[PDB]
Each structure stands twice: as C-alpha cells, then as structure tokens.
UniProtKB/Swiss-Prot annotation, chains A, B:
This is Prostaglandin G/H synthase 2. PROSITE patterns: EGF_3, PEROXIDASE_3. Disulfide bonds join C4-C15, C5-C128, C9-C25, C27-C37, C538-C544. It comes from Mus musculus. The keyword rRNA processing does not apply. Glycans are attached at N36, N113, N379.
Amino acid sequence: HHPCCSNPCQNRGECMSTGFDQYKCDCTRTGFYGENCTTPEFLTRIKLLLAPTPQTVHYILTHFKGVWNIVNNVPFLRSLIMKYVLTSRPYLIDSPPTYNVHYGYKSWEAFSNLSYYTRALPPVADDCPTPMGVKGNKELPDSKEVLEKVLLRREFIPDPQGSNMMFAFFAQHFTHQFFKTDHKRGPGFTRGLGHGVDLNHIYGETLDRQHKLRLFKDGKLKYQVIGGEVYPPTVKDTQVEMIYPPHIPENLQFAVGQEVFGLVPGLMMYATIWLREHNRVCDILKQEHPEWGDEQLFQTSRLILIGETIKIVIEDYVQHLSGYHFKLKFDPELLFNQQFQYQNRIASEFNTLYHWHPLLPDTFNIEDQEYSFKQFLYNNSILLEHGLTQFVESFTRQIAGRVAGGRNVPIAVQAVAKASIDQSREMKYQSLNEYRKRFSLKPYTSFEELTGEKEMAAELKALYSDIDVMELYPALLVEKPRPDAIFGETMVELGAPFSLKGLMGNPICSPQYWKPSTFGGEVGFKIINTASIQSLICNNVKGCPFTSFNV
Amino acid sequence: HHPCCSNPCQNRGECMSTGFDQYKCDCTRTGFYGENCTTPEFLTRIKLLLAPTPQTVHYILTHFKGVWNIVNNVPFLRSLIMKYVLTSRPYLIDSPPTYNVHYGYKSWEAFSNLSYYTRALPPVADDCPTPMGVKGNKELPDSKEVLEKVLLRREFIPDPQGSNMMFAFFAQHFTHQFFKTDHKRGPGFTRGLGHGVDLNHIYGETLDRQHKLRLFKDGKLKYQVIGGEVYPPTVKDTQVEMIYPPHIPENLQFAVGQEVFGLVPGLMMYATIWLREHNRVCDILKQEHPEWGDEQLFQTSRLILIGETIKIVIEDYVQHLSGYHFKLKFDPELLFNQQFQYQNRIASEFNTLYHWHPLLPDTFNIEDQEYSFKQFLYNNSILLEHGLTQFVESFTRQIAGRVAGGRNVPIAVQAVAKASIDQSREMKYQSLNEYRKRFSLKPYTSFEELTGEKEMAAELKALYSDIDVMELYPALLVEKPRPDAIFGETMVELGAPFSLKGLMGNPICSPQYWKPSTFGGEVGFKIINTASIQSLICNNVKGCPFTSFNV
Ligand code: COH
Ligand code: COH
Ligand SMILES: *[C@@H]1O[C@H](CO)[C@@H](O[C@@H]2O[C@H](CO)[C@@H](O[C@H]3O[C@H](CO)[C@@H](O)[C@H](O)[C@@H]3O)[C@H](O)[C@H]2NC(C)=O)[C@H](O)[C@H]1NC(C)=O
Ligand SMILES: *[C@@H]1O[C@H](CO)[C@@H](O[C@@H]2O[C@H](CO)[C@@H](O)[C@H](O)[C@H]2NC(C)=O)[C@H](O)[C@H]1NC(C)=O
Ligand SMILES: CCCCCCCCO[C@@H]1O[C@H](CO)[C@@H](O)[C@H](O)[C@H]1O
Ligand SMILES: *[C@@H]1O[C@H](CO)[C@@H](O)[C@H](O)[C@H]1NC(C)=O
Ligand SMILES: *[C@@H]1O[C@H](CO)[C@@H](O)[C@H](O)[C@H]1NC(C)=O
Ligand SMILES: *[C@@H]1O[C@H](CO)[C@@H](O)[C@H](O)[C@H]1NC(C)=O
Ligand SMILES: *[C@@H]1O[C@H](CO)[C@@H](O)[C@H](O)[C@H]1NC(C)=O
C-alpha cells in the first residue's frame, strides 16, 4: 500500500513516497527536522516553551470583565489587541490553497479548479488497509450506531451561551453563500465559485440569474408587495430557478439568490431583510448621487452590503460565539502592514464542522404557535401569516441547542447527520487527532478525555476501539465543551481561522478597496462601519423590534 | 458630461462624481491631499527629493560593469540586490484587481468575472466631449494615417540589443498563454482564465482539451514520430480543435495546447520543444518514483515545467531585455518576508504594450532559405524539412527588429498594428501621459521629447495637436529608445511591473508550494532551479545546438 498511509510526518511536514515501501518527509520551514520532522530546532524549543494553551488564552478573554471594559474603551489599545488576534497564527491556512478530495499532492488541477472544496488535510489514499490509514479496524463503525448512541437528541439541551433562533438562522443563511455542495459531482465539490462572502445568496451565483433578480431601476432588486409589506419576487415573475416541492403554489415560490432558501421560513426571513437593505442603500446612494445610473447604484450597494455582512459577522456573530469580554473589531487597516493574502478557498472541513444540527430546536415557536419540522419546512405561509416583526421578536426569544456535549441532534434531521458522517468517510477524511495536530492541538489520549464524561466515551470505545481513529465530525458534536460554552476546543481552533480568513481575505478589505470612494463616499462608507445585526433589523423590519444573537 | 472626464485627481487619487457637474478626489494613502491630491505631505516631500529618476537607475544598471561583476559572483549580494528589485514597486499594480473595460469604478462584477482583462487605468467615460476626456479634437486622427506615417517599416531597423528570432518567437509563444483575447466578446475579454503562467498553451485551457492531448501513460503527452523525430500529435488523432486553413494536409495539422500555434512554424518549434521537455521530465520522475501513477506524473511534470518557464523568463528572457550587467535571479524565498500577493490578473494594457510587431523580420532565414510571410504562415512542412536543430541554429543567428524608435512595423502585419490602435480606442484607453503619471513617470511636454527626433514628431504634432492626447500604443513604438536599446522608457516602466507580478505571483512561488516535495523531491526541484534557455534546447533538440536570445 501507499507508504504514507500511517501519516508519519509530524508538525506539518509533507510526506512523499520514494518507492513502493519507502517515504520521505519534507521538513521545509516546519521548524523541525529528522526522518519524521520530530526533532525541534533550538529556535523552535524556545517558541514551544512560551506558547500559551488555547484553553489558557480563552480563560483570559472570558474573565477579567472589569479590565476588558477598560480596554474596550481605549481605541489605541483595542486596535492593538484586535491586531494580535488577526495575526497570532499566520500560516494555519494554506493560501494559495493546496489539496482537495482528488489530490493528496499539490497540482495545478487542485489549485486552478474552483469547483473543488480545498482541504486542510489531504485525503487518505485509496489503497490504505484501514479507513484512517493503518490504525483501527478494517471498517469504521456503523454510522447509524454512532448516530443513535452519542448524537441523537433525547431531551433538548439548550445552549448555555444563550444563542437564539436569530443566531441559528443567521448562521444558516450566511454560511450557505459559500457552502453550496454540488451533489451532481459529489460532497467534495461546491457551486460557490466565489469561495467567500460575495453575497451570491442574495444576488445570484451567475450574471444571468442576477439580471433576472434586478429591477434595473435605481440599482434595486425586484420585489413584490403583500399586505403593504415588501417581499422577494416570485419564480413566475423573474423566471429564476428555485427548489420547491410540487405542492407549493406559484405565489409562494419566492425567488432569491440562493435556490434553496425556500426550504425554511427562517431563511426567507433574512432573505427578505437583506433584499430590503439593498434597496434601502440604493435610496441612500441615489440621494448622494443623483447623477448615478442604475448599474453603479446596484454595484456600489452590493459592495456596501458585503461590508455590512463582514462587519456584522465579526462584531455581532463571532463576538457572540467567542464569549469574549473583549469587543472584536472589524478594521481592515490592522492588516495593511502585515503579511496577509487577500484571497480565500473554502475548505471541505470548514463545511463539515459547520454542520451545527444540534443548534435546531424541537419546534419553531412563533408568536403563539409551536410548529413542528413538518409544518415548518417549505411553508412560507407562516412568514406571511406572522410577518417579519413577529418572526424577529419570537426568534430572539427562542433559545437554540448546544452543539458540543453530545446527544443533541434532533430526530427530524437524523438522515442529514448520518449523511455528514458518511460523506466525511466518502471524502476520505483523516482522523480527529490528525486534524488536531494539524491545528497545533494536542491529540486526545482517550475517549474520556474527548468527552469529559464516562457514558458516551465507553460507547465510542466499543465502536472505534482506538482514539486515533475517532472521526472528526462526530467528535465535534460529543466533545467536552468549554465551561458553559456551546463548542469544544476542536470546533473553535478549527472554525475560527477558517472564518477570519474567509472574512478578512475579501478584496474589499484590501487597501485599494478599503476607501470611501469604493462605497460612494463617506456616507456609504459609514453605513458599513456602523452596521450591526440590530440596525439591520431596525432599518428594514416594521416597528424596529429589538434583537440580538442571545436570548 | 461626467465630472471626472478631465482626470483631475493626481497621484493615484480616485475620482468620483458628487453631482452632475461636481467631482471629489479620494487621496487615501496617496501621500497627498487637497482638492486634486496635489499637495504633498511632509514625509512625501522627503521621499520625492531622494527618489532617483528611472533614467538614472537605468544608467547605474547599464554601467559600472566591474561593480556588477562582484555582485553577481557573491550569492549573498546577488540575492540582496534582486530582493530590492522585486520590492521597488510596492503598490504599482492593483492586487486584488480593480477596473476593467466596462467598469471605471470598483465593483464586484469587475473583481469576480475572470473573462475580463483588468485595467491599470479606468476607461474614459462614454459621454466625455473628447476621446481622451476634455483635451484634444472631437476625433482622434485616422488610425491608418497614424500607422502609415510613423509606424510602418520603410527599411528594416535591426535591434541594437541584438535580439534574435529565438527571442522573438519565445516572446510570442510564452505570452500567448495569458494573452488570449476573446474576440467573440470583445478586445477587453480574455479566454485565459488562469490569468498567468499556467502553461495552458501546452496543456490546454480546459480539462477536456488536456485529456485529449495526454497519453495517459507515464504522465506523458501524446506525440507522433516523423522521420525519427518527436513532434506533437495530429488533429485527427486527438480530436483537438486547431486553427488551420482547409488545404493543410492531415499530418501537418499539429495539435497543441494553444489553438493558434499552427499559424507560424516558429511557434510550433517551441511547442515541440516544450512537449519533449514534459515527456523528458516524466522519464526523470518515473525513474525517481516507480510507484507513481500516470496522473501524479503528469501533474508533477506540469508544476516542474511551470517553474522552468518562470526561471527561464526571468534569468534569460527578462535578463536580455534589461541589458543589465546584474544577473537577475529567480528565487521565491526573497519575497517570503515581504508583503506580496500571490495572485495575478492580466491587464489589458499589458497586452497592448506587448504588441511587438516591429520585432518581426522581412524574411525568415532558415538554413539557406529566406521565407516570406506568405510562405511562412501555416507551413509546418518547413519545420519538418529543416528540422528543429537547423531551426535553432538559424533563428539564433537571425537578428530581430527594433520595437521603439518608430517606423519598423512590417507591412505584412499592417492590419494587426492598426487593430491595436482601433481596439485601444474601442476600449477607451486614456492617453499616454495619463499612463505615464499612473506609473510615476514625468508627462511628455512635446512630441519631440517623446521621439527624440523631429520628422515623426512633426507628423504626430499635426495629427494629434496636443501631446496630452497622444495614444499609448503608437507612442511605445515611436518613443525614443534608451541608448542602443530596443525599448523606450514607457515600455520598460510599464512592462516590468506587469511581468514580474505575473511571474512571482504564481502559486508555486508561495512558501507552501516552493518545496522539494511539491516537485517530486530534490531531483524535480533541481530541474527548475537549473533551467535555462540553453539547457531547454540542449536536452530536447538533437545535437544540442548552442542557443541564446542574442545573435
Ligand atoms: C450552521 C447552522 C445550520 C442550521 C441552522 C441548519 C439547519 C437545517 C434545517 C432546518 C430546518 C434543515 C432541514 C437542514 C437540513 C440540511 N442541512 Co443544515 N443547517 C446548518 C448547517 C448546515 C451546513 C453548513 C450544510 C452544508 C451545506 C452545503 O454544503 O450545501 C448543511 C446541509 C444540510 C442538508 C444537505 C444534505 C446533505 O446531504 O448534505 C440538509 C438536508 N447544513 N439543516
Ligand atoms: C510579443 C510578440 C509578438 C509577436 C512576435 C507577434 C507576431 C505575430 C505574427 C508573426 C508571424 C503574426 C501573424 C501575428 C498576428 C496577430 N497577432 Co501577434 N505577435 C506578438 C504579440 C501579440 C499580442 C500580445 C497579441 C494580443 C493577444 C490577444 O489578445 O490575443 C497579438 C495578436 C495578434 C493577432 C490577433 C488579431 C487581432 O484582432 O488583434 C494577430 C492576427 N500579438 N502576430
Ligand atoms: C462576465 O461578463 C460577461 C460580459 O458582461 C458576461 O457575458 C454576458 O452574459 C450575459 C448573461 O449571461 C449576456 O446577456 C444575455 O442577456 C439576455 C437577457 O435579455 C439573454 O437572453 C441573452 O441570451 C444574453 O446572452 C451577454 O450577452 C454576455 N456578454 C458577452 C460579451 O458575452 C459573462 O456571463 C460574465 N461571466 C460570469 C461568470 O458572470
Ligand atoms: C474541475 O474538475 C471537475 C472534476 O474533475 C471537472 O468536471 C469534469 O469535466 C469533464 C469534462 O472534461 C467531464 O467529462 C467530467 O464528467 C466532469 N466530472 C465531474 C465529476 O463533474 C471540471 O471540468 C473541472 N473544471 C475545469 C474548469 O476544468
Ligand atoms: C427521545 C427520542 C428517542 C431518542 C432515543 C435514541 C435512540 C433512537 O433510536 C432510533 O431512533 C430513530 C428515530 O427515532 C429510529 O428511526 C430508529 O428506528 C431507532 O433505532
Ligand atoms: C518515523 O515514524 C515511523 C512510523 O511511521 C517509525 O517507524 C520510525 O521509527 C520513525 N523515525 C524516527 C526517527 O522517529
Ligand atoms: C403551513 O403553515 C400554516 C400556517 O401558516 C398551516 O396552517 C399549514 O397547515 C402548514 N402546512 C403544512 C403542510 O403543515
Ligand atoms: C484642481 O483641478 C482643476 C482642474 O480640473 C483646477 O481648475 C483647480 O484649480 C484645481 N484645484 C487645486 C486646488 O489645485
Ligand atoms: C511551404 O514550405 C515549403 C518548403 O518546405 C515550400 O516549398 C512551399 O512552397 C511552402 N508553401 C507555400 C504555400 O508557400
């Protein structure tokens, strides 16, 4: 079999076969050397003696409230710290990207073909004796058994951080602009050729689709008016392809950028909100530029909304997730004097870890009603019946589920959870511990260490036998969460670098774009720099209801 | 009309309309301020007093041979000097890219749509009172009249730098991998979506075309053997679409990566050489890795050949063009500690300036024959009759024409030269002096300063009236060349930043790629770092004839 099946090279050394039975490790710029890149240089010995654990840094940021409250009000000191946050792991993510599902070695095909998700770790070779390489049994445990024993929700477990349905649906809506799996090709392929925050889920992936969604007046998007309320246009009006079950009336077939957002009313809520925001900014821009035509109005509005999204994701969304007392800051200027690549390629593992199914509740509580999954799915009548105001007020109140900790995946999306496991194996993912080592984390030595618990650990032990063959996705869901937190260590240490790269890597954060002129002047620029989840709702939802990502 | 038509904003200031008759300049990070970004900051005033002129820096590099002899011999000093050259133009090139032919303002459509050539300067607005903005006459002079008076060749003017036909064909062959104009869409569109050195002119732009050219054995490309010599395969055998007149016999319809390379036997010479090189590398890699399969052998050979190209282009091709005594060096490690973006977008103006038609001779002298343009075009039988060895020996001896200095464009390519003028006007190029300021050059004050001569200057004066509305492309060809050089100032100061950006911006120059393991190990790595135009011919041409870019 392939000589690199056992993953011999440590510390991000690259493995290469030098024969049918022999491998070689490339230790270039790893800070290590030797046969397996395990012998540290003297400079490396120093760095390792002084590096604080991710648990220690998380403790500092989640304590000393009074101290951070002082820091958060000193602009110079806040910028300085946010600068460190953005640069404290400069080479975790490969940029330009390297491997994908079909290429465990670098190639021009892997680099140039945007239809692939990139890969943080190369796939396990096809001719390996065991699924994870050389360790474990001939076959991984039945994903059905893994699902039923440690993943499926018995009693509902609420998020201790108090995440609400506004947060859960925002997560779904935001991430599904760059998580668009091409199931015609396979789980390792994407339809999001932009590989980042381009707002294609609002404006459409292609120019053809964009032009069918546009009004071509005042730079605005097409819309309809139902009971005095502005909603997205219909499929019949725009000829925009949407995914709907056949029993859906044509007047309820709303057409938006993402073809699947008709699936859940929670997604149509944000789709409506963002559509209103686009047309709202067009009104502002037209007032600043009476001389501007439709095209420039539309494009500038798009850039501003891209800016608003990144602004919100960092200062409201990630801020809520982090649980830090330190106020994160969106400020591209912090990276101008730094080594940073303004480009991004979406990783397959970034998609996999973002399968936050436990976040979903048992029922969707709107106003006085408690809708089941069956009642809720593809039912935009619920949105028209209650309205955006009631949706926001209700979803702000309803708490979401805890992602880590185990046994909190709702029975409704059972097949989806099993698919995440199965497709991970299909894409030949390496084990949990390989991904932890890849992200400078210590490998788990036992299942009890992984779960911080005894019952599920024993279950996992009987299933996997070895901790070194434990899979990444199920581990993320059963991992011992941080104190009163929604996630475990692995989720954060993998998720965060992928996120900030995907946000700061946007071209509008590059120095030639980050100017008032790019956004139509100081007015358009300030729209971005003052944006929040609250203002987004206040400006576009009648009554201006209060909202947040916490209950 | 548009308020920015006069191009009021100086020093990379960005212009924006604020009313129907008012503009505003954005002087962000320009080092200037004021209404037109013309008032310099104090720190900026210092840098201006110290900055040496492009003429001065060129004088230093083309003189003091003894001082450069010492530098080239000591690797520490050579790397030090080359490091300065690679970082002398910090933000000359917008990366990520900005404008294109349809967008004179930053937009997501301009950034994400790879089918566009990007633009260093935005196009003149449609409703401007004159072709160049506000200056000049209602209409630019007739392009035929411009062509015939100052561009068309009277007597053949040989390049005083001694460039040969090996150079001229290498330039054409190499640059036509990223200069692939999509004439269906327009002159501002490209078919080279890789936007750089991907060797698509060898392997094909699309995976479909690539798979038709591949042998799928040992990683090699398909080929045929005629008279014991290795040539590319035919159109009939591969089903690869090529451009050939109907009368071309089946066996002379060679199939290569680029559809147009059958046009001239000089291009097929290099196409044949690179085809042999790929298969040669396959043989090397197969010996190193008996265990490797066809796919990995192909992909790794492609990465190696990409590296060879960049290596050769820098240390032989650009080295020749420069006329420097300093030996330019290809070493990606010199940028590892710098703020460099590993990405590229091909500029339309980079394409325009590379229309080096005057390079072409009156006849193509091979062995004892002197072929006319009519006889040379689409005639691969010439290549077979004389063979590769005679081609190299002959083209090494035949001198090419001078590009600058005026009146040296062969009448055979008359329509091509005029098309360069016409299409520049279609794409609404700004004037020569606007492009000189864009690249930190002093605007020409007269046509005599431009040509360093009186006769052509007088003809240009009558045709254009104002030096500030002189066009970019005709200026490059009539510009006063550097002393005993092939180019003028404007050609070098624009061409060099575009070239090095496209060469070093390649992903294989990034730290994660620039490793031995990427290229199959130290053996494959060495092939790149020892590559030369001489070694390319020596390894793949029978008899190993001497070759060079100078006669
Ligand atoms: C992050 C939060 C989140 C939420 C709130 C959420 C809420 C819901 C939801 C609510 C009613 C339903 C019915 C589903 C059901 C699905 N989800 Co999500 N999912 C989420 C994260 C994801 C992600 C990320 C993907 C990958 C999308 C892709 O690759 O196209 C996903 C994919 C899916 C798929 C694709 C099937 C497959 O084989 O991959 C289904 C079905 N699911 N999910
Ligand atoms: C760099 C040196 C170089 C050389 C030696 C060269 C030599 C020759 C040559 C020799 C026998 C012939 C027949 C041509 C003929 C052509 N060249 Co060039 N060309 C060169 C650089 C270019 C460039 C650059 C373009 C534009 C690329 C594009 O967009 O396709 C070009 C475009 C063309 C076109 C496109 C048609 C149009 O509408 O512009 C033709 C025809 N040509 N050229
Ligand atoms: C990159 O930009 C290209 C130029 O803008 C663009 O090509 C253009 O595509 C549009 C839509 O696909 C075509 O316009 C279409 O509009 C009518 C609607 O009334 C259709 O019915 C027509 O069939 C027509 O195709 C433009 O004709 C076309 N322009 C050119 C010069 O090709 C590309 O699609 C853009 N690329 C991406 C990936 O978006
Ligand atoms: C990116 O890679 C995919 C998968 O290799 C390519 O899709 C294949 O395209 C060929 C056409 O040459 C088809 O015959 C195959 O059926 C396709 N495979 C799949 C799984 O869809 C795709 O063409 C590549 N993209 C580019 C731009 O080359
Ligand atoms: C509290 C709801 C039951 C949780 C018990 C976890 C074990 C569930 O067990 C499984 O549940 C699936 C869906 O109910 C069924 O399709 C399977 O037949 C069943 O084996
Ligand atoms: C490297 O790892 C292999 C296991 O893959 C092991 O057999 C070998 O002893 C290791 N070498 C060193 C020097 O530790
Ligand atoms: C859709 O929601 C409405 C409430 O607005 C409800 O009356 C109806 O039964 C739902 N449809 C399904 C199929 O559950
Ligand atoms: C700016 O340029 C305009 C020409 O467009 C000129 O009239 C004006 O005086 C300039 N202003 C300054 C402050 O230089
Ligand atoms: C092609 O080249 C051959 C020499 O090999 C010459 O005899 C022939 O006339 C050429 N064809 C044309 C059409 O000029």
